[PDB]
């Protein structure tokens, strides 16, 4: 979140990260597996949609993505980070476990209203 007083700096306080000490330029030395592993699921999903587009046409990816957006955007529960029950069915992860599920992972900026604003971009 950028500072309200100056719209060019991160809001060190509202962005509770241990001070401004974790500065932007320094988040460049990363674990080799961090970038690949963080968005591994996304790459597989997009690759899967590409194959559907090639074979089944653009209609099938449109139907798949529209259903997911319907589920995601109609689901707002600011008291749970767990994925929706119907999200697993569409992703076909209703009988699978992963470290992201076992390990899902402050006084200031963790309130519900913070997620309400982000959810609606208000």
């Amino acid at each position: 979140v950028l500072s309200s007083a100056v719209p060019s700096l991160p809001d060190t306080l509202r962005q509770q990260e241990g001070g401004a000490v974790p500065l932007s330029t320094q988040l460049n030395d990363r674990h080799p597996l961090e970038s690949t592993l963080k968005n591994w699921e996304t790459t597989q999903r997009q690759r899967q949609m590409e194959q559907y587009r090639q074979i089944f046409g653009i209609a099938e990816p449109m139907k798949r993505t529209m259903e997911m957006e319907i589920v995601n955007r109609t689901d707002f529960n600011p008291l749970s980070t767990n994925g929706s029950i119907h999200r697993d069915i569409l992703l076909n992860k209703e009988c699978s476990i992963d470290w992201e599920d076992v390990y899902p992972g402050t006084m200031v900026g963790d309130d519900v209203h913070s997620k309400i604003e982000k959810q609606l971009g208000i």
Binding site: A5, D11, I122
Partner: protein
């Protein structure tokens, strides 16, 4: 036209935003008076209540104060956001927040929450008082759910506001504003008796909540 924020009435005003103001008018009375070098805030206050764990006047910073009227729950959250901004500004910048800046931010939050049909705007009108850092000019501001913020010499919001805003209008002279802590306090007390807790903020982050106002009540009552 009544049931949405995104719809203008044919006459040209948003009813839903107006309906938020009537919620403020249902809230407890709040008052504010600007002296020559001080600002006074008065508020309207069961048998079994725990009075030692309750002050309707919550300070946003060492030098800024914020009273409110309307839904208490909304105010408690609007106050929290203002407090964080005050320290964040004190962190990203060095100087403390200007009183005009804080009310502008608070009004922005209220204005921001009006920019979607899936959010209920805060049914609270704030009455921000304080002094700019290293300044001796009292400043009092009022914010509304619509997001409009104004600077007032003396204002009252909430239950019995028109009757109290008429008493102040005739007893308060912009060319003859009170020039003593007692004078403004008496006006604030007299303002509240037309229908007690009084808070006085003085320059250089000197905020004190008065006790034993009965002397002023007894003095004003006799007169």
């Amino acid at each position: 036209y009544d049931r949405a924020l995104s719809i203008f009435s044919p006459d040209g005003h948003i009813f839903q935003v107006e309906y938020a103001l009537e919620a403020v008018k249902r809230g407890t009375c709040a008052v504010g008076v600007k002296g020559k070098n001080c600002v006074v805030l008065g508020c309207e206050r069961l048998k079994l209540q725990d009075t030692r764990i309750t002050s309707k006047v919550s300070k946003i910073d060492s030098h800024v104060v914020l009273s409110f009227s309307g839904l208490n729950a909304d105010s408690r959250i609007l106050i929290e956001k203002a407090r964080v901004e005050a320290q964040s500004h004190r962190l990203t910048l060095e100087d403390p927040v200007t009183v005009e800046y804080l009310t502008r931010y608070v009004a922005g939050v209220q204005q921001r929450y009006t920019q979607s049909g899936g959010v209920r705007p805060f049914g609270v009108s704030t009455l921000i008082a304080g002094f700019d850092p290293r300044d001796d000019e009292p400043k009092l501001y009022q914010t509304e759910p619509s997001g409009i913020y104004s600077s007032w010499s003396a204002q009252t919001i909430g239950r019995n506001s028109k009757t109290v805003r008429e008493f102040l209008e005739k007893n308060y002279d912009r060319k003859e504003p009170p020039a003593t802590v007692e004078e403004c306090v008496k006006l604030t007390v007299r303002s509240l008796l037309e229908v007690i807790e009084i808070t006085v903020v003085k320059p250089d982050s000197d905020i004190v909540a008065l006790s034993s106002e009965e002397i002023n009540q007894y003095v004003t009552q006799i007169e």
